[PDB]
């Protein structure tokens, strides 16, 4: 149960390593203590790279996704592993 | 960066006993932080509001505050 700031730093590192990804939004609440992310990815490869790179630090639960010819937009939930 | 802004917010909160953060949301389009907070007093809320400036602009909605 790491501090929120430490988990955000971890997320920043993961994002810095994955250039075909951008964070569009983030939400957190004290009761659930999970990070809900809306992400934009240039391709399915870039999204999977983000998902893999977030482990084993986090457990990743994908939400809904919208795939179009210009990229993928979707939601992911990160919880501590 | 979002992480730097959270760190800034943490510093503000650590200096303001009487304030608790219940939830937070950020989006790129507004480049904005929406906070659900609990304050023990109007006094504590005003101290938070003042301490958050000039780093952030504070827009008030227990309640919701928006920091940009």
Give structural notes.
The structure is a homodimer. Chain A is of the alpha+beta class and 81 residues long. Chain A has a single domain (1-81), classed as General secretion pathway protein M, EpsM (Gyrase A, domain 2), CATH 3.30.1360. Helix content of chain A is 28%, strand content 46%. The first copy, chain A, contains two helices and four strands; from the N terminus they run H-E-E-H-E-E. The first copy, chain A, has helices at 4-16, 44-53, and strands at 21-29, 35-41, 58-68, 71-80. Chain A has a four-stranded antiparallel beta sheet. At the A-B interface, helix 1 and strand 1 of A face helix 1 and strand 1 of B.
What's the CATH H-level superfamily name of chain A? Answer: General secretion pathway protein M, EpsM
The fold-level CATH name of chain A is Gyrase A, domain 2
Query: Based on DSSP secondary structure assignment, what is the total number of beta strands of chain A?
Result: 4
User: How many separate domains make up the residues of chain A?
Assistant: 1
| Element pattern of chain A in H and E | HEEHEE
Radius of gyration of chain A: 12 Å
Spatial order of strands in the largest sheet of chain A: 1-2-4-3
**Major β-sheet of chain A, in short?**
4 strands, antiparallel
- The CATH architecture name of chain A reads 2-Layer Sandwich
Q: Which structural class best describes the helix and strand composition of chain A?
A: alpha+beta
Which CATH top level class of chain A fits? Alpha Beta
Instruction: Give the quaternary arrangement of the chains.
Output: homodimer
Tell me, briefly, the overall form of chain A: globular
Work out the strand percent of chain A.
Answer: over 45%
Number of helices of chain A: 2
Helix content of chain A: 25-40%
Spatial separation of the terminal alpha carbons of chain A: 9 Å
Largest interface: A-B, 17 and 17 residues
PDB class: protein transport
Keywords: pullulanase-specific type II secretion system, integral cytoplasmic membrane protein, structural genomics, csgid, Klebsiella pneumoniae subsp. pneumoniae NTUH-K2044, Center for Structural Genomics of Infectious Diseases, protein transport
Assembly: dimeric
Entry title: 1.93 Angstrom resolution crystal structure of a pullulanase-specific type II secretion system integral cytoplasmic membrane protein GspL (C-terminal fragment; residues 309-397) from Klebsiella pneumoniae subsp. pneumoniae NTUH-K2044
């Amino acid at each position: 149960h790491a501090p929120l700031v430490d988990r955000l730093s971890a997320l920043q590192n993961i994002l810095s390593e994955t250039p075909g990804i951008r964070l569009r939004a983030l939400s957190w609440d004290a009761a659930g203590n999970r990070l809900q992310l809306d992400i934009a990815a240039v391709s399915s490869r870039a999204l999977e790279q983000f998902t893999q790179r977030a482990q084993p630090r986090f457990r990743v639960r994908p939400g809904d996704m919208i795939t179009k010819p210009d990229g993928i937009e979707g939601q992911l939930t990160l919880e501590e592993n």
